[PDB]
Ligand binder design. Sequence first.
Ligand SMILES: Nc1ncnc2c1ncn2[C@@H]1O[C@H](COP(=O)(O)OP(=O)(O)OP(=O)(O)O)[C@@H](O)[C@H]1O
Ligand SMILES: O=c1ccn([C@@H]2O[C@H](COP(=O)(O)OP(=O)(O)OP(=O)(O)O)[C@@H](O)[C@H]2O)c(=O)[nH]1
Ligand SMILES: [Mg+2]
Ligand SMILES: [Mg+2]
Length: 331
Amino acid sequence: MMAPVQKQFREFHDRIKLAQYDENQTLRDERDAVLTAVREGLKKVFADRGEAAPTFTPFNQGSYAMNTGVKPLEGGEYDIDVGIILNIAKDDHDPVEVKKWIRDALKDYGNGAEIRRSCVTVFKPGYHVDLAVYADPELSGGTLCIAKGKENSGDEHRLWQISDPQGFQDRIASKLSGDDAAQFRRCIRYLKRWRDFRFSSDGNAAPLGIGLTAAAYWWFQVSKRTDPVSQNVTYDDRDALEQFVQTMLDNFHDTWDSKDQRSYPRLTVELPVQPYNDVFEKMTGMQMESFKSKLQALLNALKTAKSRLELHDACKALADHFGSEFPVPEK
Ligand SMILES: Nc1ncnc2c1ncn2[C@@H]1O[C@H](COP(=O)(O)OP(=O)(O)OP(=O)(O)O)[C@@H](O)[C@H]1O
Ligand SMILES: O=c1ccn([C@@H]2O[C@H](COP(=O)(O)OP(=O)(O)OP(=O)(O)O)[C@@H](O)[C@H]2O)c(=O)[nH]1
Ligand SMILES: [Mg+2]
Ligand SMILES: [Mg+2]
């Protein structure tokens, strides 16, 4: 038989999922509009260089490429992630210089464009496009490097960093297959909506979607049951989330801070590809403590939802952490 609240989890997922690039013409059209804008802008930017603009190869990045995207809450923005590999040698150019090429290309597009430590972001009514900027591996020693650093960053934090976004995307796509991979992606989405619902008071404190995605890569485990008579398989998203959240909580470690003279709980989640960085490294110790506490509250609700006699009460317990799209059947 079907798991206790599985129907409501699937309805919740139906309500929060955003179709990936290959299934979403609106996202493809917005992405391609930005790409055309950067092509024409590069024409204009290199008009005063005496040379044709360098060409680039675009590729899908992020959750819309990995089929892990969620709809924003009301008032939020879509996040269109794309990479562009410019036909340039990384040692011949400064990373901030190349990102400034791209930013000046998009200077008069939409609400504007700005250079961020890891990308150039252009803004548009209801969504922003994050263009990660890379040098050509053929001209840069065979390595794919992203342009890191901003004008304010200075000198030490400005570099071409080895990067592997397509390797990461392959890792997320390949960890599981079929309906197992479906449950994996559903649980990443559930946690992204939890993030949006319970970290809205301080968006800087929120655990990034990339962090939750990498954590799922390391620690998600499928939860399913095979009927001993029909061999019919049913998935148990509530149990899968309970195991995954418990494993995340188990991987927090108290971490001394000499300035504050105390420990904070920290979850370290290495990217499984280059540059193998802790995707949570920017979160402060206090933000980590709050993250852990809300994770524990979510885990407690997942456990409570297993024991409620009334489906209404189990679903309400979950809605308290997942927000208004989680169905709560009447009692
Ligand atoms: N801190 C990071 N470390 C390594 N790679 C990152 C990091 N942040 C972003 N990336 C790369 O850029 C992509 C887009 O980042 P983003 O923060 O939009 O995550 P996402 O997977 O699109 O999740 P979301 O649905 O929350 O946007 C990621 O999939 C990842 O490949
Ligand atoms: O390795 C990376 C990192 C980041 N990105 C892309 O750049 C976007 C911004 O990445 P962040 O949200 O981590 O901010 P930042 O590193 O650019 O630093 P600040 O300017 O905010 O101080 C991310 O959402 C992602 O799409 C990559 O493509 N690859
Ligand atoms: Mg994204
Ligand atoms: Mg982004």
